[PDB]
Design a protein that fits this description.
113 residues; mainly alpha; 6 helices; globular; Zinc finger and BTB domain-containing protein 48
């Protein structure tokens, strides 16, 4: 009915789709670990993915294997708005946020205490 109700419905479906690898135009190969996602959503949060999209003419994205640990946390942030920081992962997440040019995640990492 409302736009808010519809927004929730769409985001819940986007999350479900990413988990199931459905209607996903982004394939991200992180050291043999394959993540499916939506460029629309990646480009929302990451300047790196905005830049990589280009004309859309593309292909899959192979990312450095080092991201495998915490890339899923970043994707979770893109899809939910929550960044699951801990004392143990903060520095790794901060580095990924820098490399992926995710200003909101940088700020959350810096303010983490």
């Amino acid at each position: 009915m409302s736009f808010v109700q519809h927004s929730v419905r769409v985001l819940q479906e986007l999350n479900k789709q990413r988990e199931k690898g459905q209607y996903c135009d982004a394939t991200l190969d992180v050291g043999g670990l394959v993540f499916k996602a939506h460029w629309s959503v990646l480009a929302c949060c990451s300047h790196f993915f905005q830049s990589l999209y280009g004309d859309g003419s593309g292909g899959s994205v192979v990312l450095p294997a080092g991201f495998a640990e915490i890339f899923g946390l970043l994707l979770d942030f893109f899809y939910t708005g929550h960044l699951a920081l801990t004392s143990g992962n903060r520095d790794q997440v901060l580095l990924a946020a820098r490399e992926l040019r995710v200003p909101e995640a940088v700020e959350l990492c810096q303010s983490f205490k």
